[PDB]
Amino acid sequence: QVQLVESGGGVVQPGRSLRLSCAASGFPFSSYGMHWVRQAPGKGLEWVAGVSYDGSYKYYADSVKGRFTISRDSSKSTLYLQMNSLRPEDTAVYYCARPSAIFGIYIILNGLDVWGQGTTVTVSSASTKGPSVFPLAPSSKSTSGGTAALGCLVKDYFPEPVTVSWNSGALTSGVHTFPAVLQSSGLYSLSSVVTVPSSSLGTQTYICNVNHKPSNTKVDKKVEPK
Amino acid sequence: EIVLTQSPSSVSASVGDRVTITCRATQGISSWLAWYQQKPGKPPKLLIFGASSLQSGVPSRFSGSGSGTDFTLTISSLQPEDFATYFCQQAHSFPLTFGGGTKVEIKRTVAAPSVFIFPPSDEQLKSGTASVVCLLNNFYPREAKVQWKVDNALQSGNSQESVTEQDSKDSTYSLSSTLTLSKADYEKHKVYACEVTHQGLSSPVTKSFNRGEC
């Protein structure tokens, strides 16, 4: 009922601009102050900007002063965050948040009642690139055995994310798809692994399905022992 | 600028346990401290404001206390849906400030990792770069040390690590380590090894292959 809908995120090269939007519904919008909060991947929460209910007073973190501009539109019940001179340090998921009232009293400084779903901002000089997919072949140092491990190296793609399934979804037990790491080149790389019984090798085929929609890339890599 | 310091950074507990998280401020914030809950992929969720006032709908097992500089969040009996990250927030003054966060994890018995090493594929070798991957599978607790060695030479600055969350069925972790070399460097040496130090191991486990077909 009461919710904040966000939009405007995306991938942008360093030094460019972006404008975030937060549309409110279900509550009196222009009675509340409003805040923008961001959270870098793996990091914690950081407040970036706030504005009073009437738009007369605006507050900024030191990290964004002179660069970010907060504003609001009462007719549209919409909150804005104009972000200029973006740098990779600004890569995060951005939220709009509403300070909680205390028994009818609207205070801009309180715990944050309601949060938007978030919109992701990526600041990178990298260009869209499909992943290279390499097999992590299962091994042996005898002929028979117990449980074997095989996997899929999804390397050098941009931007996030890639989806990985095994045998078109028929293989889910023992699967670990690891979070991507950001390499020095600016491209991402992750690996998906699965543990199988050693009797399966040779009899059962293992196919790793990698989809990267930003580049319309779809790869089916069969992983067999060398 | 007021800075908040949460303690501890993480805690492992079982369902039914009593968990106590503290938040310390560099200045006095009277009673303008809020507590949040966050699960991966979702926005934060307010639990406490005014340092003791429960949000509407939040279970009564969540209690907040304290004033001035020292504060405390308490969960009187942990429930399965309470394993998440918890943040304190200061609302005494601008700028608004969050604590580093406290992650409450599922406690279980020690589990030693299964270690696997994977040589680079021949398809990648044609591109001019080689990636050796090492897998640590289903271990607990999370603390582990992976050291790469090539011809017994300890590597530095050419590897990256990635860890999953606790598995939904056995509460263990898994870890992937990727050593990245140039093909010329890779063909220049023979034995590639992955050394794993974990408290479930009496001695470090090393897995190794040697380049060729061995």
Numbering used by the authors:
A (entry chain A): 1 to 226
B (entry chain B): 1 to 214
Sentences copied from the publication:
Here, we present structural information for the human antibody PN-SIA28’s heterosubtypic binding of hemagglutinin (HA) from circulating and emerging potential influenza A viruses (IAVs). The globular HA head domain recognizes host proteins bearing sialic acid on their surface, while the HA stem triggers the fusion of viral and host membranes following endocytosis, allowing release of viral contents into the cell. Anti-stem antibodies exhibit much broader cross-subtype neutralizing activity in vitro and in vivo by inhibiting the low pH-induced HA conformational rearrangement, hence blocking membrane fusion. In our structures, we found that each Fab variable fragment interacts with just one protomer of the HA trimer, and PN-SIA28 recognized conserved residues in the stem region of HA by binding in a very similar orientation to the HAs.
PN-SIA28 had a large number of somatic mutations in both VH3-30*01 and VK1-12*01 genes compared to the unmutated common ancestor, and has a long heavy chain complementarity determining region 3 (CDRH3) (16 amino acids). We determined the structures of the PN-SIA28 Fab fragment alone at 2.5 Å and of its Fab variable fragment complexes with H1, H14, or H18 HA at 3.2, 3.4, and 2.6 Å resolution, respectively. The high-resolution structures of the PN-SIA28 Fab alone and PN-SIA28 Fab variable fragment in complex with H18 HA allow us to analyze conformational changes of PN-SIA28 upon HA binding in detail. The structural alignment of PN-SIA28 and PN-SIA28/H18 reveal that their CDR conformations are almost identical, except for CDRH3. The CDRH3 loop formed by residues 97-100 G undergoes a largely rigid-body rotation, pivoted around S96 (CDRH3) and L100H (CDRH3) to facilitate interactions with HA. Additionally, the side chain of F103 (CDRH3) moves by 4.5 Å to fit into the hydrophobic groove of the epitope. The structural characterization of PN-SIA28 bound and unbound structures highlights its long and flexible CDRH3, which can accommodate the differences in conformation and environment in the hydrophobic grove of the HA. Given that the CDRL conformations in PN-SIA28 bound and unbound structures are almost the same and CDRLs in PN-SIA28/HA complexes only interact with Helix A of different HAs, the different Helix A orientations in different HAs cause them bind to different CDRLs.
